[PDB]
């Protein structure tokens, strides 16, 4: 039940931009004996609670030039990482990990930690998960931060969150590619890739949590849910996108990184359509998957917009 490995903490020892304290979280309800973490920052008695939720295949390093955006604002910043990724720890095995694993995690941590006015900010899994929180529990949801992400319902449901799975070849089939492939996985060389702008050091920072591929079984396993959507993920997807629709009054912002092979306007733009009041898009001509590395003007803007509508 639940073999897991931790990565060591000397790995995080010279970590660029990420001055963020450790909290962890042990034993959470159905995840005995497994070390989660994530940060805390900003007032931890505000009124506002930021979910940042990272996806495939980073940790909260990726959210770092939001949070302090966030933190000044006057408002609290929650950055978990999932199991198998940053400093939370790692299941060796690919069958261990599942969409309820990783969704069940993120209702555990919100009960956990009582999470109340919560602007949900998700990009990539971030997204095919988080976008499926609110649902569960309506009331601690305030609102929103969408970006490049959709829903895992089915081909027939929404073709569009399902077509950049084939096309284009260079897209989601290529990152993919570089992830399930290499016997010797370099995620360092990965975000460089898929990620150009970044510098060696950030690029460093994503290598980071994995000493060796023993810890990438999380990493693996991502990539091939997208694919092949279990049942579960399917329905919860698509009761997903009745809520975003017909139960969703919160605020909205959503930000497209328009120079993204997999998750962009293709995607995008039929998912401001079923997001009840989705305002028009902040469309970012430089961004690429990781639309967060362009994330200060993405948090600048959200909270100016947030504000206008208060």
């Given at each position: 039940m639940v073999n897991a490995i931790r990565t060591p903490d000397?790995?995080?020892?010279?970590?660029?931009?990420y001055p963020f304290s450790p909290n962890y979280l042990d034993d959470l309800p159905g995840y005995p004996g497994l070390r989660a973490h994530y940060l805390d920052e900003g007032n931890?008695?505000?009124e506002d609670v930021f979910l940042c939720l990272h996806g495939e295949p980073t940790w909260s390093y990726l959210y770092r030039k939001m949070i302090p955006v966030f933190a000044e604002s006057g408002a609290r910043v929650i950055a978990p990482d999932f199991f198998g990724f940053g400093k939370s720890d790692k299941p060796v095995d690919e069958e261990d990990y599942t969409f309820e694993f990783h969704r069940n995690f993120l209702l555990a941590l919100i009960e956990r930690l009582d999470l109340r006015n919560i602007t949900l900010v998700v990009q990539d899994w971030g997204g095919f998960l988080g976008l499926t929180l609110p649902m569960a529990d309506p009331s601690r949801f305030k609102r929103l931060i969408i970006m490049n992400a959709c829903l895992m319902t089915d081909p027939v449901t929404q073709p569009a969150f399902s077509a950049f799975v084939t096309q284009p070849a260079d897209g989601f089939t290529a990152y993919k590619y570089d992830l399930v492939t290499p016997s010797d996985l370099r995620l360092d060389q990965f975000m460089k890739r898929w990620a150009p702008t970044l510098t060696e050091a950030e690029a460093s920072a994503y290598a980071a949590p994995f000493p060796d591929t023993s810890y990438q079984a999380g990493v693996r396993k991502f990539p091939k849910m997208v694919a092949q959507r279990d049942q579960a993920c399917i329905d919860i997807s698509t009761e997903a996108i009745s809520f975003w629709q017909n139960d969703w009054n919160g605020q909205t912002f959503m930000a497209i990184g328009?120079?993204?092979?997999?998750?962009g306007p293709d995607v995008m733009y039929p998912m401001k359509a079923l997001i009840?009041?989705?305002?028009?898009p902040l469309e970012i001509?430089?961004?690429?998957?990781?639309v967060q590395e362009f994330g200060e003007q993405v948090a600048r803007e959200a909270l100016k917009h947030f504000a206008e509508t208060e």
């Open positions: 000397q790995r995080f020892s010279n970590l660029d931009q931890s008695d505000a328009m120079k993204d092979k997999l998750l009840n009041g989705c305002p028009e001509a430089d961004a690429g998957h990781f």
